[PDB]
């Protein structure tokens, strides 16, 4: 055993000892500013608060109700063969992380394609910061005993509406994330950051799914300024069933799984691994805030450093 | 460089670059508990408070008031020769982290020999208390703007006073600390536990101060039942005069020095680095809250045995 081993040993014995991060809290009532930032925020610890929300959205957000008020616009919707965009697929025994087919189409087209189970995967996600209709829907006020912590305004806000099938892959965001689901529920599988050493990642050729005019999927690569290979590290393990054999390291770490129910709000704090499966015609939207770092961000670096 | 090296040269230049306990904050105002909360507890991070606190002892407290006040009392005294309780000395060759001898004397004893400069080095030390002339000059509820951030009692209170050379060598404690000076200065050297690995520490066997039949001061090792020698890892540095040709890691260190007057509070974090002066006669009082653990406590860890 080396000793860059055994730092990594003596900060996994020391966090399983203490049990860090080995639950996810669930709340009843939303705290206030106080606790969210002492008990929460400040231990980099996911919660989740049950009913929290009773937005008018939350009763009345739909994929027709959503085309009604949203005058049927064109929308950027992601689609894929697998269901897996910004994920690990297979081609001409090359192993890719593969982005999603970006195209438009109208919110209408959508629904129909989301109606086929045979079809292919699709997903909405739209970034900003008839919006105004919408935003009639929320309360963004409501998230103040989380915001006073981040103490900024989200430097973004994601509605996402999609596909049971669209599952996105283990990955860490360095953003707080406040995470409210309005249609559905979301399952999140989440793993501590100081488990770093525990989830395998690799290098990995990037790729784009792409149709043919026969209207088949595949991957095309992807190319720099120059024209050589673009590359992306990613988690190599699947959560949902892991290969213990070929990641032994994984039997180590300890995944935290919590489903968010409409009208939950879940915080998943910056640098947490996740991994999000749903429900059909799930609708959520999430806020992220640009973290502000500490010495836990620091000895991250440091982990990612150790874990070659 | 090693792997490890390499690991820890990653740790100090984030950390650099980030201003990660680059000072100690400056405040004018007290803060909210909210504020306190979220820009000092959960970054770890100390800030001083100027002009604080209106108690009536900020003002009033000397040993002569404190004398007339408690009606000559019979206190606990540490002595040392050399000024350093809990501090390394050397005897016969070999260097000891030695402890204060502790004995009982009266109040006007212990302001005779605080006026004796010829004499040992004199300094009182008292764990917790309630006495009717002296809690009434204090009014803990002030410190609420933090003790909310640690939502528990005190572990202990420690009431301070000391001669000019009583000096306190450069430790950590497992407590959030809330320091008041109530008359004099203290002149704090800090240092943030991210830095760890330019801190040099020893291997020390224990010693106690004794005086012979014919008062000379010795150091007495310490024993168990066994009969075995005691030890005691400590910081060997010393921030006043340190010898960079002997820790030549301690370079990279950035220690910071703040000075806490009458009525200032100081904050020190958990696990800081802390070396203490004070004026003569200064007197102190200090609540100590047990940590509450997260992943930082097991990073530090993991960092104590990478400098090992
Ligand atoms: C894609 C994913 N969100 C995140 O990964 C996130 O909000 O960080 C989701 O909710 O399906
Ligand atoms: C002994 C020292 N206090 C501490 O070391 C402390 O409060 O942690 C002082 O007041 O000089
Ligand atoms: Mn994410
Ligand atoms: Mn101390």
Same mark, same amino acid.
């Given at each position: 055993?080396?000793?860059?081993?055994?730092?990594?040993?003596?900060?996994?014995?020391?966090?399983?000892?203490?049990?860090?991060?080995?639950?996810?809290?669930?709340?009843?009532? #939303?705290?206030?500013?106080?606790?969210?930032?002492?008990?929460?925020?400040?231990?980099?610890?996911?919660?989740?608060?049950?009913?929290?929300?009773?937005?008018?959205?939350?009763?009345?957000? @739909?994929?027709?109700?959503? #085309?009604?008020?949203?005058?049927?616009?064109?929308?950027?919707?992601? #689609?894929?063969?697998?269901?897996?965009?910004?994920?690990?697929? @297979?081609?001409?025994?090359? %192993?890719?992380?593969?982005?999603?087919?970006?195209?438009?189409?109208?919110?209408?087209?959508?629904?129909?394609?989301?109606?086929?189970? @045979?079809?292919?995967?699709? +997903?909405?996600?739209?970034?900003?910061?008839?919006?105004? %209709?919408?935003?009639?829907?929320?309360?963004?006020?409501?998230?103040?005993?989380?915001?006073?912590?981040?103490?900024?305004?989200?430097?973004?806000?994601?509605?996402?509406?999609?596909?049971?099938?669209?599952?996105?892959?283990?990955?860490?965001?360095?953003?707080?994330?406040?995470?409210?689901? #309005?249609?559905?529920?979301?399952?999140?599988?989440?793993?501590?950051?100081?488990?770093?050493?525990?989830?395998?990642?690799?290098?990995?050729? @990037?790729?784009? +799914?792409?149709?043919?005019?026969?209207?088949?999927?595949?991957?095309?690569?992807?190319?720099?300024?120059?024209?050589?290979?673009?590359?992306?590290?990613?988690?190599?393990?699947?959560?949902?069933?892991?290969?213990?054999?070929?990641?032994?390291?994984?039997?180590?770490?300890?995944?935290?799984?919590?489903?968010?129910?409409?009208?939950?709000?879940? +915080?998943?704090?910056?640098?947490?691994?996740?991994?999000?499966?749903?429900?059909?015609?799930?609708?959520?939207?999430?806020?992220?805030?640009?973290?502000? +770092?500490?010495?836990?961000?620091?000895?991250?670096?440091?982990?990612?450093?150790?874990?070659?």
């Amino acid at each position: 055993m080396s000793e860059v081993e055994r730092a990594l040993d003596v900060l996994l014995q020391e966090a399983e000892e203490l049990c860090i991060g080995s639950s996810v809290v669930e709340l009843d009532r #939303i705290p206030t500013a106080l606790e969210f930032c002492r008990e929460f925020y400040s231990k980099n610890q996911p919660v989740v608060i049950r009913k929290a929300l009773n937005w008018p959205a939350i009763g009345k957000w @739909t994929p027709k109700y959503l #085309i009604e008020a949203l005058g049927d616009r064109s929308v950027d919707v992601a #689609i894929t063969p697998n269901g897996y965009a910004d994920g690990l697929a @297979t081609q001409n025994g090359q %192993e890719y992380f593969v982005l999603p087919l970006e195209t438009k189409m109208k919110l209408s087209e959508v629904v129909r394609r989301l109606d086929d189970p @045979t079809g292919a995967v699709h +997903y909405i996600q739209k970034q900003n910061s008839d919006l105004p %209709e919408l935003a009639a829907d929320l309360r963004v006020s409501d998230l103040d005993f989380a915001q006073q912590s981040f103490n900024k305004p989200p430097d973004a806000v994601n509605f996402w509406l999609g596909d049971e099938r669209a599952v996105t892959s283990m990955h860490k965001d360095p953003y707080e994330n406040v995470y409210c689901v #309005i249609s559905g529920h979301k399952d999140f599988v989440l793993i501590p950051p100081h488990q770093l050493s525990c989830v395998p990642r690799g290098i990995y050729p @990037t790729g784009v +799914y792409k149709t043919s005019d026969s209207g088949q999927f595949y991957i095309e690569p992807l190319r720099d300024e120059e024209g050589s290979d673009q590359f992306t590290e990613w988690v190599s393990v699947d959560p949902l069933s892991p290969d213990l054999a070929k990641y032994p390291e994984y039997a180590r770490a300890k995944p935290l799984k919590v489903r968010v129910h409409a009208g939950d709000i879940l +915080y998943l704090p910056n640098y947490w691994f996740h991994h999000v499966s749903q429900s059909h015609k799930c609708i959520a939207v999430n806020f992220w805030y640009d973290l502000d +770092y500490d010495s836990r961000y620091c000895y991250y670096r440091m982990l990612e450093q150790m874990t070659s």
